[PDB]
Amino acid sequence: SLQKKLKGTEDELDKYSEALKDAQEKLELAEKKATDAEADVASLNRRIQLVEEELD
Amino acid sequence: TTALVCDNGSGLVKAGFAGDDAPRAVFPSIVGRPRHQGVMVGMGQKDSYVGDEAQSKRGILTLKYPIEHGIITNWDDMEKIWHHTFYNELRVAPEEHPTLLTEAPLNPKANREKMTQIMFETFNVPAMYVAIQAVLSLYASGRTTGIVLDSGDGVTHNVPIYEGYALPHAIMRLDLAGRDLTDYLMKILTERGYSFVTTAEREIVRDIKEKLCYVALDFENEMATAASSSSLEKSYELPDGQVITIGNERFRCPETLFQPSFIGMESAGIHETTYNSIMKCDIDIRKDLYANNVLSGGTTMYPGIADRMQKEITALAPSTMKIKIIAPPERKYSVWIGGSILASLSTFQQMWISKQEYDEAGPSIVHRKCF
Amino acid sequence: TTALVCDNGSGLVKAGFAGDDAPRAVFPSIVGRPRHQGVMVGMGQKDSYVGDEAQSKRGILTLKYPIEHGIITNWDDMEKIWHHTFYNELRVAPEEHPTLLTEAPLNPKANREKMTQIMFETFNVPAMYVAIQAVLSLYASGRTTGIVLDSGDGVTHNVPIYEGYALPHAIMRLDLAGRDLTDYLMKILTERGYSFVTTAEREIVRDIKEKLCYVALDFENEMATAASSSSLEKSYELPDGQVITIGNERFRCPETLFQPSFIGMESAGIHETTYNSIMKCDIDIRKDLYANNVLSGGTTMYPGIADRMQKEITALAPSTMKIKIIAPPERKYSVWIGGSILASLSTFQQMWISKQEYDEAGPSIVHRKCF
Amino acid sequence: TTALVCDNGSGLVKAGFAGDDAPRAVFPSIVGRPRHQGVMVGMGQKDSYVGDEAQSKRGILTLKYPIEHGIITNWDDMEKIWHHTFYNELRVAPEEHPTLLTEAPLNPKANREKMTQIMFETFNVPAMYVAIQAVLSLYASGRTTGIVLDSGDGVTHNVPIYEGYALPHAIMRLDLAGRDLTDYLMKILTERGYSFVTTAEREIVRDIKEKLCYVALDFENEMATAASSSSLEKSYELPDGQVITIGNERFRCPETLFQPSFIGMESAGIHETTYNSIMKCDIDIRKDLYANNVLSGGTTMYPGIADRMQKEITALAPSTMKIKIIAPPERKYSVWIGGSILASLSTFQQMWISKQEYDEAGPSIVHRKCF
Ligand SMILES: Nc1ncnc2c1ncn2[C@@H]1O[C@H](COP(=O)(O)OP(=O)(O)O)[C@@H](O)[C@H]1O
Ligand SMILES: Nc1ncnc2c1ncn2[C@@H]1O[C@H](COP(=O)(O)OP(=O)(O)O)[C@@H](O)[C@H]1O
Ligand SMILES: Nc1ncnc2c1ncn2[C@@H]1O[C@H](COP(=O)(O)OP(=O)(O)O)[C@@H](O)[C@H]1O
């Protein structure tokens, strides 16, 4: 009689696995984006200090 | 037919066809051999990996460079490099294509002679030609005068050219380059505990250098800024994890180019050998040379190196001349681009060293007016 | 012809033919001798029982293991074991079949030499070969890199392999295994009154261990859960009747693998010798090793041991790497499966030690490149 | 007032007074803690044993080394080592004694900074100074030029000095030393049947190494001599009887210094790093460097090390040179002897770092001119 319990557990497990996969996908995406944006801002900031000493 | 343009360099092979805008095969000039025993039978593993494959198998191999400072020291390794370049990266038969090779000024003559002998006997090319790297850089830059500073990975050299005439007595060559900068960074990174000793951690240190190092416009002020603040301190993530933090040695590494006493050398910085080459040239081409100071090669790719070079040369030269430094974004490939231009020039098709000329005059035919 | 694959191990003999999916003869590696007098004339009873028959006559015999920790200590007993394996379980003539034997890393050399001498003089095989257990485990796992943790019944060892090259300086060997876990369980089962002292009650305790023990994902929380509840307490029925109830020592037994101080050893757990082997390897293969952590051998068959190992190694290694633990269901037979694969490889038929090679070079020929 | 010379080393603390001929206190730099429970009430036993005492209770304790490769890893038990040195071995109050400490080249900066912070705040010494070990070795040897190889227990380094000027770009540092040799000997004895795993058995193995190992003049010929004769076997007596006999292992252990690939390192032997450090130096001083090759430190004490190293460096250098290896009998104390000489100089009494100097400039004052 516990087979329905087993099947329901399998279903919620599958749902949670899909959820985890989607969350990992969004995580790696946003992390690549944040790292790239930080690279750009650091580069251009150093460039700003260089053009500032240039102006000086 | 088409000619190949193989810019051997010292630490990065760049090959392609004459008439293209860029090389189609850029890979490290390394040859790796396994140093452990190897247990899995049936693995059938090779005995030496060349090029970009060795960088994948780093953790298992010992990486050796066959070119120390322009000069080739391991001829079997260099022959493997060329075989890989011809057959695996380009996929061409070298017995149907002329080949243009490049070399730095003031190398031994046996280097060039043995290179020619290899290219005619082993690879069996129909023609070949050895060109100077700085001249080809000036071709690619669009100039016809100007003093070029070609800082590769083995050597650094200035070659002043005016109206297409080179002034050989004013050629300068310095043996400080990217390899010495990598060794200095390996050495000064131990002040924070990081230790890189293996021949395969040198590649990690080279990556750190390329991605984080920069030239300070003023060295004492950046020293003080790093001593006080922490705004210039940046992090890097090793292949293992365990991020490392780089402080003021972001700009102490390339400062060795302007203060070669850091690595115990006697000579003067690049800003000063450039000026000494100028002042060794004539008096009535110095204004043009000051105005056409051309940079090329990978070691000139640091952020701020052009501004630093200009500040220094400006403080050196008289106060009444416009000092200008030409630093294109495609600096690293300037020698190859110029080589492609030259080999495509229709006027050049009479400057090749044909195979019959070689067969009749020996390898000594390389130092003739084709020099 | 076909080769035999005899995975001697230490506490379980596994033999078969090269080219099968599983061993066809798995029996304990014990030799029993009667300890009582024997009254019925005409019984004609034997003087020593080998293998699975001794486990039937347990109550009358003294059971001895001829292999302590990988190392063979009783050569006459081991020769009886091999004779039984060849003639009674497999029913083959060993003078027609090559034989592949297995051994653990870092054993004495006389072990391997005397094994070879026996296999050529006594059993008269045509060829033979001694292989390392971890390499064969990696064959059976389908990998070619990865750090393998082969916890048998005598020894535990890590052997990191990358691209088919083994890194011998990073091999670790620990003398804690299933036999020590059995002794610890015998000892801590006395807290509830059960006493198992005979050499034949050790087999009952081993059965209890196999059927009831498991690894706790967190040790203090399971300690508290057992102190409060009774939901983790389970029962077992001896060969005599009189069921015994096992409480929190269901998970205190295999916890000795992660806290060898329980049995008074100095060393560190398996989760920590694995990580130390990693950190002793290079820097640019550590990511692959973290991702390919392979388990094999019978002592890795506890429920929850993979999850525990992953939790521990994950808390040890840097936070930016995917740590993965490969634990197949047919772990216990991985060494044998890999041995069959290897001996069936056609490339391997040149790695055997033929009989003429031995006759001409002595038993020292075992430590040569066939090592 | 007199100064204290504490050559903390890595594996032996040597302390004494400046102006003496030898260190007064020499004991292992070890902190032991009990790993068993302790039953006798009233024993009043303490929590951690330091130094030479911890070797008497070695069987009960688990021994830690607070210095790994020159670098200090554990700081609390290093304060314990220093406290024991000052109060229990020398019986001096450090509030009125300047203290001279040594350190290896190319170490982290935080090592020195924390060392001086501790020596000024925890012990309140009036002055202190951190010296390089190789320079002190040259002082004690009586030279003023010469390339010094200082093989301790954690680190090996070469420091070429000419006319009193050290050439820092030619300083080599290698992390192969006596502790790595002990570990290789532990791992290599296993093949003969003996197993030493505990940190308390590592000390027994270190004793075996010190009393029986030696450097072979020709490695292959000695391997053949051991494979044929038996005139190499010597026997050692463990603390509990149980005599053990070793052959090959007598000279296979210190051969790791000349072939670091035995323990899986990539670097080159001590002979080759000595030669490379010479070739990094200017061409004019290589004569004197070849003629003044000074050995010091404990790991240079094997019989035959000087003859072997002379043979190697002679086969490396040109045939015109006179290679000489200076190896005094009081070799392993040369750093301390030189330190005493140095702190005893009247010219030195203005190169200490004072208390108020530190209080005003912070711990960063260690790297500045007060070196
Ligand atoms: N962005 C960068 N910043 C600093 N150094 C760089 C950069 N890119 C490349 N390099 C250095 O340039 C060297 C390669 O120069 P390259 O032009 O390839 O000369 P060659 O072809 O003779 O090796 C490498 O050693 C590398 O360290
Ligand atoms: N399911 C299990 N759970 C826990 N331990 C087990 C299990 N199955 C076998 N073992 C242990 O594994 C040991 C045998 O391991 P094995 O792979 O046979 O090594 P060997 O072949 O060297 O004896 C036995 O001592 C037994 O206690
Ligand atoms: N007679 C000897 N032969 C070989 N090795 C020795 C001998 N005596 C000491 N050693 C080794 O030297 C090391 C200690 O060297 P030492 O000069 O004390 O360096 P440190 O002071 O940094 O510990 C020990 O690890 C020991 O193994």
Side-chain angles (χ1 to χ4, degrees), chain B residues 310-350:
Chain B
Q310 177 165 355
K311 170 168 165 293
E312 300 284 7
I313 297 188
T314 291
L316 276 178
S319 157
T320 181
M321 284 180 286
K322 265 76 72 170
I323 297 189
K324 184 186 176 190
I325 290 172
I326 292 90
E330 65 292 5
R331 255 169 293 183
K332 164 176 282 191
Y333 312 96
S334 273
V335 179
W336 192 93
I337 294 170
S340 70
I341 290 181
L342 172 74
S344 89
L345 288 198
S346 64
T347 315
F348 182 83
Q349 312 309 131
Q350 315 171 7

Side-chain angles (χ1 to χ4, degrees), chain C residues 7-14 133 151-154 178-179 182 206 209-210 213 297-299 301-303 332:
Chain C
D7 174 24
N8 289 303
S10 172
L12 209 56
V13 175
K14 293 179 278 290
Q133 298 184 347
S151 191
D153 185 27
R179 191 93 50 78
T182 301
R206 187 184 47 74
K209 167 169 69 89
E210 297 184 358
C213 275
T299 319
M301 289 304 308
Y302 294 94
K332 164 177 282 191

